[PDB]
Structures are given as structure tokens and as C-alpha cells.
Write a protein that binds this ligand. Sequence first.
Ligand code: HEM
Ligand code: HEM
Ligand SMILES: Cc1cc(N)nc(C[C@H]2CNC[C@@H]2NCCNCc2cccc(Cl)c2)c1
Ligand SMILES: Cc1cc(N)nc(C[C@H]2CNC[C@@H]2NCCNCc2cccc(Cl)c2)c1
Ligand SMILES: C[C@H](O)[C@H](O)[C@H]1CNc2nc(N)[nH]c(=O)c2N1
Ligand SMILES: C[C@H](O)[C@H](O)[C@H]1CNc2nc(N)[nH]c(=O)c2N1
Ligand SMILES: [Zn+2]
Lengths: 405, 405
Amino acid sequence: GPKFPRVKNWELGSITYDTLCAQSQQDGPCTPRRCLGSLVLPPPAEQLLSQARDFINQYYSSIKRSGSQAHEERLQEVEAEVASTGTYHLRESELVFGAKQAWRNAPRCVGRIQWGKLQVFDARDCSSAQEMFTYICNHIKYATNRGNLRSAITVFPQRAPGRGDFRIWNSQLVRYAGYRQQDGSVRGDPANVEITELCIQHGWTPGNGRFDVLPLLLQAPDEAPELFVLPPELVLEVPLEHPTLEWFAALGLRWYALPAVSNMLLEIGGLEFSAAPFSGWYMSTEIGTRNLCDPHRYNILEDVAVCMDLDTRTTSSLWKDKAAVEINLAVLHSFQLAKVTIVDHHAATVSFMKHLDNEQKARGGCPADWAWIVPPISGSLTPVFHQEMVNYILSPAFRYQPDPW
Amino acid sequence: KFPRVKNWELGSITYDTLCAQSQQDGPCTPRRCLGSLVLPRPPPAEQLLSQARDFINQYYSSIKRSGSQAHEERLQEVEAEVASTGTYHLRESELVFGAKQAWRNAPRCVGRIQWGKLQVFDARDCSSAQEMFTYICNHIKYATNRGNLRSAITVFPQRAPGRGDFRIWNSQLVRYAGYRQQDGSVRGDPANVEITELCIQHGWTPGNGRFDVLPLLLQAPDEAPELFVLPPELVLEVPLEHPTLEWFAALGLRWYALPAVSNMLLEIGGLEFSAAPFSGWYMSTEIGTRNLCDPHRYNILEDVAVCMDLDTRTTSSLWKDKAAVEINLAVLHSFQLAKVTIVDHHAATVSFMKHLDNEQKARGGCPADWAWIVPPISGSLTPVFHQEMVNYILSPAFRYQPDPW
Ligand code: HEM
Ligand code: HEM
Ligand SMILES: Cc1cc(N)nc(C[C@H]2CNC[C@@H]2NCCNCc2cccc(Cl)c2)c1
Ligand SMILES: Cc1cc(N)nc(C[C@H]2CNC[C@@H]2NCCNCc2cccc(Cl)c2)c1
Ligand SMILES: C[C@H](O)[C@H](O)[C@H]1CNc2nc(N)[nH]c(=O)c2N1
Ligand SMILES: C[C@H](O)[C@H](O)[C@H]1CNc2nc(N)[nH]c(=O)c2N1
Ligand SMILES: [Zn+2]
């Protein structure tokens, strides 16, 4: 029939064709010989121009003026600017449209149903590492909004030819310290050992808990990184407790409310924003299953299982499954009680099916990474599991980038 | 060229160099990944001849006699036969090697640690449905072994240029019927609705049960299929009860012990066996999660939930996750009680990790489809979730083929 990928939903038996994949101008890791879909990781004025033209057309299409006078002029306005400086700048609303497009285009984000609701903070005037700090404090403030979380992204100056990038060293605006012990173990979060040690090498006076909030290593162009400590009043956290197991609270586990990625590059129309932290609100399994149960993270499965008096001697007791469920229930329950925005993997995948249906009608498909869309617990119990998906790269987009050091 | 495969729990790395032996293509392309798709969207003597050499080369290397006399002589035989007749035949030993390799190369199978222990029944001297049926009965008696399941395959006559294929119409040799009730609902297994009808349309006296073992429709070349009924005593079944929830058994749930796929095609050295049913033993999740909990299957989550008195009012109570875990527990308990081989998803993925290791040293890699290797529940609580995988097509291989109607 149609010569586009055929996508089927094995629950509902429905079929769709992805025609949006044809707009993709960037190749992925696969080839007909082998699929590398499970791997976590992967200017020429000539090429910059085409990327920019493509973006501008996308913008004007979004406002329904393709072929118009404003459109053809803006195109000429960009070729002119690139023609005499090698780069070009985006208009305010062009930045707001691209930032939202990049989110909407993110194949791994299950929360894209919210893609249209992104508060974009233009911080392209920012010229000092101290100022970056200010912008972020504002970001954290606006997004945290006392628990009623709001999606937001702050965009710092774009990379300049022959100039240092604006960079945020931490992977997230809020992350707990990871202290390499004497005996080899790690106190806190093993994911952040390297960032923690980098903070110390830079003057941070380390604490010694399992939940010490790390300071930020911010960096203005061509200068070494300045170190900033977030005011505790700003970093809202939720102490975890179980709705029925009274001892869970005794574990002293907790998590911060704001998930804010900060080391990703925001690419729009060829331009590169190396410092453009974005935040939303958590899906419960991020905390409850990955951060708290991953063998290489807090690894609290055994502890909790012992507490529940489960048979952790044999696998067939499903002691891991039982505890993981309760840890997640606790993340959900605690956040709800503290009145901090959160969403469980059921609600979250259900709204993503809705997003899929919306996008089918609006663009003819949705780039999605199945392995990342399906939750880390109860996989086939959510509807996305039964939904085939086509994964590809559209731009604007968010991309991983080499750590600055 | 060669892909780098990484394990994110241990930080270990490997290089898959086995994918370079993949002669057949997948659904992916550099532009878009279609790895989550469940199905893919006489032969010239020259092509068949090379697939045959390759396979014969594979076989002799396997027994350490490559280059030897027997090897060169065998290659001539195959060539003499292809040239003269446009096809050739396998020697029993070669057939046993091919079948074992086909299982070894099954990307979606997590039970491969066992690949070397497979009882192979050569049934190529079959000339009728009635004969196929005797063969199928012996396979079941052998594989079932009174609950101490043994992995087996039975291979019927290869396909032949212009002449119908021998075929087993059922997808598995043991399936429960799915009867469409008046109200659009379905009594029994909804997945087996079409097949349950085809048997009726071919004279079977249906039942009115939720777990009515279907009869087998066996088709010898160019002849309407024939209906055979499995002797109730040949089909071992397990009654499901819960290790602590006494009310569970009252649900009258039960599942068969033998998982035996019968509608897939086995390809060895370019030859095609359109009827080669194979079986092993179950992994608890297949029954507890997918069979009993899939929306489009027996869909028993709600019932079990209410029976556990759970707030099924909101998703955030995780009633679904809680119920699913108990159901998987009943399956594992029940089978261990009935002394019928079964393996839970933790033990299973652990052994698969070991297998990737033996395969790494042995062949330079191992094709795996991440989405299928990671269990349907508690995904990240298993080692496989954290393991990157390269997926491609090796031969001998098991392929999907059109339904014969
Ligand atoms: C509004 C609520 C949101 C929810 C619950 C949500 C949820 C998620 C989840 C569950 C993941 C996969 C995380 C993982 O397993 O590592 C993810 C990935 C991602 N999300 Fe969202 N997201 C939200 C908001 C946002 C916003 C505001 C942006 C961008 C403006 C965004 C951009 C991304 C990107 C680029 C990824 C892929 C990169 C990565 O792996 O971290 N998300 N999101
Ligand atoms: C002995 C233990 C065995 C177990 C626990 C096991 C388990 C599994 C599981 C869980 C899958 C995923 C299927 C699904 O859930 O949809 C799978 C797929 C598969 N297995 Fe195995 N397996 C075993 C033995 C065998 C044997 C004996 C063969 C063949 C000789 C085999 C051939 C395959 C093939 C061809 C597939 C992919 C095709 C499909 O079913 O969709 N398995 N196996
Ligand atoms: C805005 C936003 C909202 C939201 N709810 N979730 C996210 C996702 C982040 C919060 N949970 C972890 C994830 N961060 C990135 C995941 N791992 C990235 C990675 C890749 C390769 C190597 C390493 Cl070490 C880490 C972002
Ligand atoms: C030997 C073996 C042992 C074992 N433990 N499990 C299996 C797996 C099979 C038994 N449980 C599910 C799977 N059957 C095939 C899965 N889907 C097939 C399919 C393909 C196309 C369309 C549809 Cl609808 C279904 C095989
Ligand atoms: C190796 C494997 O790709 C890796 O563990 C992936 C699997 N799926 C994931 N899915 C999400 N949402 N987040 C992750 O970090 C991962 N990790
Ligand atoms: C479309 C999607 O890939 C499909 O539902 C897959 C996902 N993972 C699976 N994993 C296993 N073991 N078995 C399956 O049938 C599936 N189905
Ligand atoms: Zn792929």
C-alpha cells in the first residue's frame, strides 16, 4: 500500500503510516544489516544556510504564511546575515517556536503531550557566569512554583565561531553528591561521583550525606568555571514515606521535585545553544525505579525487601518486583501528599497514546524510541508497550554533547 | 564499522564483529529505526548454491574438519544436486546442527543459554497429515516428559518448487479456544479466535470453556487440512493457585505446560522447512503477564485486583502493578507445585547475560532484540535492561511465514 513505515498497535489492532519520517534530515545509528536502536549514545556556511532555511520554512508554516512576503524576506535576511558573519540570530518568537519543536521532536520523552506548554526564557543577553546563576535561580523558582510545576527552558547565548561556549557542567540543575568512599563503596549517588569530585577540585567544601545537593559549575565563554551554591530555600525536596508501611519513612529517603536537564545542546535551524537547561516534572518511575533501585544507583531494593521481610534468597519469590512496586508507590504517595506535581507510568503512557494520535493527525507520525517510552516497571501493563513505533531524528532538537572538561 | 556494545550497570564494553556475517536485511535504515515492529513489512541455483556452501562450511567447521576430505566431497554433492535438480537435501547430522544454530541465532529468544541441548526429530519421511499427527504426538510425549520439560524440535518435509507446503495451521501445538459470544465479547483466548473458527469450519465440535484445548489442523501438500484431536492425557496442564491468597484458585485459572511454536519456518542452507514445530519450557512472565494480563488476552487484572480489594479507582494506586505481581507469583508457585519446569524472568535474564558472554568469546557477538529480551514487568530490575544489544539476521534462522489460508 503506502510506501511509508507501517505502524501497528497490537492491542487495538489499529494501523497508521508514518509520513513525517520523510522530513528527517539526519541519519541515525541503524542500517539494513543491523539495528543499534538499544544504544544509549550515537560551521560550513553552505550547510548552515540550508538548515536555517529549513527552520525558517518550518516557522512560517507554523504560523500559516509559507510563500508569503514576510517569509521570503526573512529567508533573505538570514542568507544576508550568514553571508556576512558566518552565523545569524533568531527572532524572539522563532526561538520560542524552535525550543517547543525540539521538545516535541524528542523521541525519548514520554511527556510530549505537554509540548505546547513550555515557558521559554530568553537569556541570550547573559554575559557572565554570575548572571547565568541568576537566570537559573529564576528558572528554578518559576518552574518549581511551590510544587505546582511548570515546564520551562532558559536559553543562554548560542555558540559563536571562535569563542568559548556557555556551558553548565552539571548534568541536571539539581543532583545529589556522590562521595567515593575509602572502602570503595559510594555514599550518595554513584551517578554523580565524577561531577562531585570536579566540584571539590574547584573549591566546593563537600558534605557527607546520601542526599547533599551539589553546587553548580557554570561557565561563561573562555573563562574557567565559577562555582555556585543553590540556596536551600530554592531546591524543593520531598521526604519519602509509604501510605501503609510505617517504617518506610524511617529509611530517610527523599528526592528533589524539579527534574532539570542541563548538559544538552539545543539545536535550532543550524544554531547551537550549548547551555539551555530545561525542566518539567517527574514520572514516578524515574525516581522509584531507576534512581532508587538501579543496581548502579541507590540500590535500595534489598534494604526495602528485608524490611518487608521478603525471601531475598531466591529469585522466584519476586522479592525485587514486590519491593520495587512499594518504593514506586511511596514516591507517588509522598509527592502527592507534599502536593508536588508528579505522574505515574500508567497515566503518563496513556496521555502519550493521546499525543501519538494528535501528532498522527497534525504531522503524520511521531518519532518515538520504544525502549525509552516503555516504563522500567510494569512494561506491558501500559498501552505504549503494544504500540509499534518509528524512531528518527527531526530538528529542532536536543542532542547530547561532550562534557566540557 | 564494528559496533561498540556497552553495559551501563558495569561499564563494560564489547565489539560485536559477528554482525558482519549477516547476509539478510532488517527493517532499519540510517533514516529511521523500525526495530520495535513485530513482523517484517525455484530460487536461482546461484543464490541457493552459495547459501548451501556457506551452511556446509559452517557445519564442517563446527565439527573441526573444515577443508578435510569429507568437506570437499560434501560440497560437490550439494553442487551436483543443485545443478541437476535445483535443490539438495540435508544429512541428519547437518540437520541437527542447523536446527541448533537456528535457535542459537533467534534474536528474540532469551532461553538461548540452552541452545545446545535440543532433541531433534527427523520427520522428513512424512507423507500425510495422519503421519504428521503421530510425529507431533511423539514430540509432545517426549518434550513434556511428565513435567520435566525437555527442549525439542520435529522437522517435517522441506518445501518444494511448485507443490504445496506441509503446514501446521495452529500457531502453537497447544492453544485454548477463543469463542466469539453474541455480544462481541470472547470466551477463552481472544488471540485464538480465528483459529478456533477455522477448526469449527472444518468439523470440530466446539466447547464452551475458557480453557478448551484446541484440536490441530495438519495439512499435507496440496490437500485441505485435516483435524486431529490431542489425547487429553498427552497435554499436561497446571492449575493456578496462590502461595498465600486462598481465594485465588477459585478463579479456576490454568495454563498448559508445553510452549511449542508451530507456524514458523525453519531455514537451513537455503532450504525451507515450512513445518518444524519447536518447544522448550515457559518463562513465568509469558503466562502471568502477557497471557493472563494483556488487555487483548484473558485480561484478568481487574478481577484479581478487586479480589485483592484494591483501589482500582486511580492508576496512581498501582493496583495494576500489584495484581500483576501476584499473578506471576501464582504461575511460578503453581508450576513449582506441579513439578513442571519453569523459569522466572530474573533467573532467565541472568542466564542470558551469561550466554551473551559465552557467545562473545565464541563468535564475537550475539544478536539480540532488546525489546523482546527485557521481560514485560520489572524491566530494569533485570540485568538485561542495562545491556546494550546489536540485532541482525544470522542463518540458520527461524522466520515468520504467511498464514496458510
Ligand atoms: C512535563 C513533564 C515531563 C515528563 C514527565 C517527561 C518525562 C520524561 C521521561 C520519563 C524521560 C525519559 C527519562 C529517562 O528515562 O532517562 C524524558 C526524556 C526526555 N525529555 Fe521529557 N518529560 C517532561 C518534560 C520535558 C521537557 C519540558 C523537555 C524539554 C523542553 C523534555 C525533554 C526530554 C528529552 C530531550 C528527553 C531525552 C533526553 C534524556 O534521556 O534525558 N521533557 N522525559
Ligand atoms: C527452554 C527454554 C526456553 C525459554 C524460556 C524461551 C523463552 C522465550 C521467550 C520469553 C521468547 C519471547 C517470546 C514472547 O514472549 O513473545 C522466546 C522467543 C523465541 N524462542 Fe525461545 N525459549 C526457550 C526455548 C526455545 C527453543 C527450544 C527454541 C527453538 C528450538 C526457541 C525458539 C525461539 C524463537 C524462534 C523465538 C522468537 C519467535 C517468537 O516466538 O516470536 N526457544 N523464547
Ligand atoms: C525535563 C525532564 C523531565 C523529566 N521528567 N525527565 C527528564 C529525564 C531525566 C530525569 N531522569 C533522568 C533523565 N536524565 C537523562 C537520563 N540519562 C542520560 C544519560 C545518557 C548517557 C549516559 C549517562 Cl551517564 C546518562 C527530563
Ligand atoms: C519455544 C518457546 C519457548 C517459550 N518459553 N516461549 C516461546 C515464545 C512463544 C510462546 N509464547 C509467546 C511466543 N509466541 C510467538 C509470539 N508472537 C507471535 C506472533 C507473530 C505475528 C503476529 C502475532 Cl498476532 C503473533 C517459544
Ligand atoms: C542499554 C539500554 O539501552 C539502556 O539501559 C536504556 C533502556 N531504556 C531506557 N529508557 C529510559 N526511559 N531511560 C533509560 O535510561 C533507559 N536506559
Ligand atoms: C510492538 C512491540 O515491539 C511488541 O509489542 C513487542 C515488545 N516486546 C515483546 N517482548 C516479548 N518477549 N514478546 C513480545 O511479543 C513482545 N512484543
Ligand atoms: Zn533499528
